[PDB]
Amino acid sequence: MTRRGKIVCTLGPATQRDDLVRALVEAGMDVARMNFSHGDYDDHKVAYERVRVASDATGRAVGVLADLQGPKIRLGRFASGATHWAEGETVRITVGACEGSHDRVSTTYKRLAQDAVAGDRVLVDDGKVALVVDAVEGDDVVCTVVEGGPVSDNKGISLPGMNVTAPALSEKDIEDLTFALNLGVDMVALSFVRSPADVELVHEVMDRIGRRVPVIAKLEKPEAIDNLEAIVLAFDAVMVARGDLGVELPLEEVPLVQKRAIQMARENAKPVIVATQMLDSMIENSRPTRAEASDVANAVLDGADALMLSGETSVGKYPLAAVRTMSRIICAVEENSTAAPPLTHIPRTKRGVISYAARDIGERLDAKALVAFTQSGDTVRRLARLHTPLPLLAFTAWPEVRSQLAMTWGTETFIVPKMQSTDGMIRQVDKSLLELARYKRGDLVVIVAGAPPGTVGSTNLIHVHRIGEDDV
Amino acid sequence: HMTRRGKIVCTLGPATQRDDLVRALVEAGMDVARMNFSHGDYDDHKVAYERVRVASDATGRAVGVLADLQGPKIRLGRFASGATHWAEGETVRITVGACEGSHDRVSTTYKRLAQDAVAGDRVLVDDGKVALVVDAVEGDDVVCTVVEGGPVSDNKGISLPGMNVTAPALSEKDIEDLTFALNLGVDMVALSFVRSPADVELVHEVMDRIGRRVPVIAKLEKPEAIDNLEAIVLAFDAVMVARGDLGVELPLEEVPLVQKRAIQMARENAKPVIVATQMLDSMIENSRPTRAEASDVANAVLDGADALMLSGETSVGKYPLAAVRTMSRIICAVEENSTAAPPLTHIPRTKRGVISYAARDIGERLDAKALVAFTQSGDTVRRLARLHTPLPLLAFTAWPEVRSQLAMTWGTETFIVPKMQSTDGMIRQVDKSLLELARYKRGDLVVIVAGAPPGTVGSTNLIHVHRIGEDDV
Amino acid sequence: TRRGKIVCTLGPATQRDDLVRALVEAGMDVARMNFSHGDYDDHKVAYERVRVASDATGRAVGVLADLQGPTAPALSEKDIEDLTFALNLGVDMVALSFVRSPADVELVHEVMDRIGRRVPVIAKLEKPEAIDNLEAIVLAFDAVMVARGDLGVELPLEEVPLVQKRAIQMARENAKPVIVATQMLDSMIENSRPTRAEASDVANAVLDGADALMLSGETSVGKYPLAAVRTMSRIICAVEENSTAAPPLTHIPRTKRGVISYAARDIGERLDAKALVAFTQSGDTVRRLARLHTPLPLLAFTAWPEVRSQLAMTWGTETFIVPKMQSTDGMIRQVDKSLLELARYKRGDLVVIVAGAPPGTVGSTNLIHVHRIGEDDV
Amino acid sequence: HMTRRGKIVCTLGPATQRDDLVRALVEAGMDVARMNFSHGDYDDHKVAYERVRVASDATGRAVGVLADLQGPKIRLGRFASGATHWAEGETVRITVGACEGSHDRVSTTYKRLAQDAVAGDRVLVDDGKVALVVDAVEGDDVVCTVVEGGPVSDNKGISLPGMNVTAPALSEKDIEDLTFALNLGVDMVALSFVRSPADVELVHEVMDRIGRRVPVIAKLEKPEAIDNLEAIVLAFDAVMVARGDLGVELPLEEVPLVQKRAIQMARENAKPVIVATQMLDSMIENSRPTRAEASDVANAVLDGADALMLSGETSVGKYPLAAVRTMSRIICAVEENSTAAPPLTHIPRTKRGVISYAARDIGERLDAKALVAFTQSGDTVRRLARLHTPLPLLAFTAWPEVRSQLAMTWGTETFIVPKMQSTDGMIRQVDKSLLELARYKRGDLVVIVAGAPPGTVGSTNLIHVHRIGEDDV
């Protein structure tokens, strides 16, 4: 009926101009990403509020997503500005301070010396240049260049295979998380996730400050894909970072890891975001490459809850066009086929059997919408992963949840009061839906909800009715 | 299956008039009591009727009361000697005039026989044991030739397959009996000799004149009924497969397929179906049935029948209790052995239908202890019963009459409750009613099917899964 | 024409001149010699009268020798004598009474292998211990006979109709033939017509899925032996001409032989074939198709005439004798030749043939071939 | 899946002319060699053609040869300066007359451009990198305005979306190239610029004049082709999805769905489908592909494609071997992971079709080591290939040409054998051929699909299941 798949946009320099955050929202932004690798806390505060004003003004829900940097592992500065590391040369990467020199340059990752051992590979600038550790002589990691090429200030370094010992949250991240939690963000994404235990360190900080939001694990490393199931269960959502996965994994394995992660997320009613290398050409162009449009469309077809724009909106010259184009692709894929990859988990539990039954009933009776009452989102997220073409309307008393459900597939959320009785809950649904030009009296709707209000049995009720069938 | 699901109808007569015998039936399993208005004066019925109601109250078991209307009385008159023998090839006269019976000439009770019969029509006597053929009508007399010979005696039944019979489906006598039964307070009425869907209208005329309707059961006795099977099942509220009678007027080998087809047809439309006659007739004189009879009963059960019926076995027999116990024991045995009954083919398309199927699925998938259905007329319960789900099926109704009417519906126990004021109060009532009987306890999972806000214009439209007393404190 | 098969018992009542032939003409498919009655000479004379009748009419007729049976061993001393006699006499099958265990067949096989001649052994389901081992017995024996009268002596009477259904099902799942016997038309021992209750009972055996039904005293000692067979036939036909199908089978085929039989039926039905043709050396391939109770005519072709008699008791199967086949292509040409000699089917009519790889191959059934009659006729 | 199923097409050019390089491709996995008639003179092709045939014989691997016809050459002429710059808002003239190139005015190779162009038509240049709009046709000059600016050089491609282009599908030059290729002995021909199902007839005219037909592959390059997708897939023998070209004339977001739709359409009709353009273009300059490219390839495989095609990657690139090795490695990885492919909706209705599906079922159910199909033209094997069954699929044919033609069909290896004399002999041949391979041994179960008696009128009509050498001595 409208766009189902959700769009995440990154905020940066390019979205600071007059009424531009609002222009994004109007073009379709559902979640706004605050990237804490860049900007001062003040730039974020001002972006954060511009989103909230835009969300109020337009009426559209917009979640706010705090992206934590994780371990900053990159080159230091060169005195020259740049150099060239040709094959066979010896080079020293040091955890000490030094001036940028062809033969010797610093790294930001202070533990590199203690972690590196003879043999470990060291990749630079998205794996464009590759080195190998010969030995650790004090603060210096002595390497040999295996694949040559140009190198400059502050290029990324990847250490596949190496037993890296940084925690998932740096000291700097804890400050950023704390800031974001107080600022009022709706979700937090953790980078460099390697184990299901990594969520605990985010939860420590949340419980100290006394405020928890959904935590999104970013799938960037092989160790993450090695624990894919345990991670999807321990976190609240996942983000497939294809660029980063492509650096450390076989390139041919990556398209299958994407599909597998998306499937895994849907089986467990967790949201999945697909990020990186989406429409990167639109950083410089008003239109994408054919290859990019195809790639995006396959993310949609793979079953993804949301797709994410990075530089396309954060630094690009065509931020609106990027969002409009992502929308137009998502729509086109959806308008063409209902079908998404089938799920294999058979529902066994009261809440699961009911979610499936509700969808069946709704589809079989040609309902105009599927209404789900929810206190945390769980009940709606269980319906969303089915990719039913029924509009999916969440009704909740907790307004935070409306923002959190911005990143979940096909879902619009309405904020309503706490319900006093089941019959009152039906009356509320009528009231809320009739306010919208979309619905009128006579339209068939399916409601999923709680026995007597605030019951010990959670979701346990399916109710089919036409709007205002009992009004006179 | 935790209990007997299939229901048992028993006929009341001479054999059930002595001391606390109606009660003995009920305790043995009788779910519906049949009052057969071809025998007894109105006083015998009044006394039986009340004995059933007292038994029902005493035991706590629901017992429906079924008024069987006679329809056209078509049989031989009396013979002066008491009997004769009509041997093959002989000419014989069956007359609408009064006469004393002789071999050559005997009267019939069916006064229109002369004007209805035509050259060629077959005239079958004594459950089709002897067959004649009309050569012509000379005045009073229908002049026949014997095709299959055998003995004939006073007042033996006559069946006229193929013949353009012109009696109405409701005789003058039936209208009196119907009127009596309606006022007496019976819960259902069965019409004999049904040939067309229109036949129900003549019963409805009488009901609406007296101002009281009950479910009307079409008895499938004639070929013309099976010719209109679908239109009849839709127009009536239930059907009864009368096997003996169908066996006389159709090829005997076609009957087992007609039974299956009628039962199927009834289940597709959420109408009850009763299977009657040729059940355990040997038990009129014997304490045990023939193997062939046990097989017959079991096949009715397997065919998908809501209820099975005893006739002479309880109404005139010498072993009425044993007959009911035996029918029960067979029904149980068939059920305890397989869940499976013939699949239904109607795909549900309507809100009420989709919900009934969904409720059953949910109930079975979650291993619910019972499936509870609220209902004003039975419709919602009957839609679940036809599925032959092994979940106990508990109807909740405000109308007490319905509890008696649901006595003939498969697998169903009914509870009578107050009018509900709110949906949440309705859930609380279900808990209260179930807990009264020390079968359900706190924690047992049940599925409820019911009405949006109480007295909603959308009838049944709600499915609700809960464990008993999960919210009490 | 009739699909379900009829077994008739021979006795005093069928010794009249050309009465056996009258049975065969009325429909007898299997002739039962009951070795609890008669001298060996009465059997010899009946045996030959059947064989002459079978030749004369052209109709296949199996001969089933019924060992009386007799805690007791499975085979009495007397049975061993009767079995030995019957085997040499040339019977096509043996039925064993009082079967209680799957091991019981071994004692019959000992005797067969001593004399050097094996035929199918039919276990008679007469006792509770048999029903307790129903599956193991159906597997060890080659066929089963449901004796309802006898089961009714020791079992709850109401349980018997469900045991009948269960045994018939069990037999069909394992491609064994099942006969339903006892209490069929016993009234016709004294009457020219049966009770309604009896006609209904027979029809229920048919509908339950039975390969064959059996007459006992009705033909062996009755006064209306022909009428009994004619009436059983007329009923079986009438039941068949109505009902479409038989109780579904649930056993999933997993073996080469089984997967092919199911596939052949599917292909046949999907393509609207007029017939299902089976080549067979031992019967197995035909028996696998018969148990399906497919409404397709089922035509068996065999070189071994003993097998044509043995297939007489399998459902819906007509069997023809042909020569030993020299090559697969020759075998297809034979099927065309034989089918045109029936002149039953027409120019473009499809049939499906199931057969053996190269003739006398170690893989038994392993070939499906769809062809039109006279398609390679230029 | 036991080996690579999806097939690889490689284009031959300058980069594949060096020492034993065609052979190195074949060894790396090339199944079809594309001869592109937009580059090279007839002598370069003759030498490539023979190098392929020698390589095919030497390695034992089947290698098809594919003649790609240019179709209408629609592009810029030459510039005197060599290149220019067309900036937005400027007026420029593209002329069908001869001239040397200036900024203001340059010639086109497409001589009909004047007669075809009308006010409003768009003119896209160099893969749509620059866009113009026609203001008028003033004689030989098509006077345009630049809508999207950018650099332009000698001999750049132009696309004319929407414009009623009037060139036939076969130029005069193409007919010469087709004729050459047919005599040379190529196994298939691909036609560019296909717009209608009638376009195949013009190729068939030429084939029938020369007296030799091969499969004709329609290249899906234009919107009009996708508008007739079904009629085209039926009239041609195969299709090639050219995504780059479709991307210039169609909405970019629609292209991924057109690819999927064409692949599906081809499989439903047992026609091969090749997916071409922009597969691993980065490997023209690099020893490894972009992640986006590997993903794209893998999605073509998953979409259901019979074959994937390399263009510049092998024809002009610096890593031609690595390109084919990499394409192989991706195809394998996708396949080793899931045997699932998009389901088909085609229900088989015909004797030959029902049998093909039944054979597959039987094979899969019995866990056969291979499915052997006898075929005169390929049709029988192509009907099994589109099912994407994980059974090895072994074609047996007496026509050697078919082995080359089946090189582009999914999952299919072909064996060339003598004409069969008898069905039993044909089974013996299957054993003989398979036993030569160390892959098969005595005892392996295989399913054979074939013809009744050899040279029967009833096409495919026989399924035979056997273990290799079960009757051996």
Numbering used by the authors:
A (entry chain B): 1 to 472
B (entry chain D), D (entry chain A): 0 to 472
C (entry chain C): 2 to 71, 165 to 472
Quoted from the paper:
Unlike trypanosomatid PYKs that use additional salt bridges across the C–C interface to stabilise the R-state tetramer structure, the motions of the AC-cores in MtbPYK require the disruption of C–C interface interactions between the AMP loop and the C-terminal tail loop (Thr455…Asp470), as well as the hydrogen bonds (H-bonds) formed between the two adjacent Cα4 structures (Thr422…Asp423). To study this type of structural plasticity and to probe the mobile secondary structural elements (α helix, β strand, loops), we superposed monomers (instead of tetramers) of all available R-state MtbPYK structures onto the T-state monomer structure. We then further analysed the movements of superposed structures and found that Cα1 and Cα4 both rotated and shifted by ~6° from the T-state (yellow) to the fully ligated R-state (cyan). We propose a three-step ‘rock-shape-lock’ model to describe the synergistic allostery of MtbPYK: (1) Subunits of the MtbPYK tetramer rock 9° simultaneously from the T-state to the R-state in response to substrate binding, movements that are coupled with interface-loop interplay and catalytic-site formation via the movement of helices Aα6′ and Aα6.
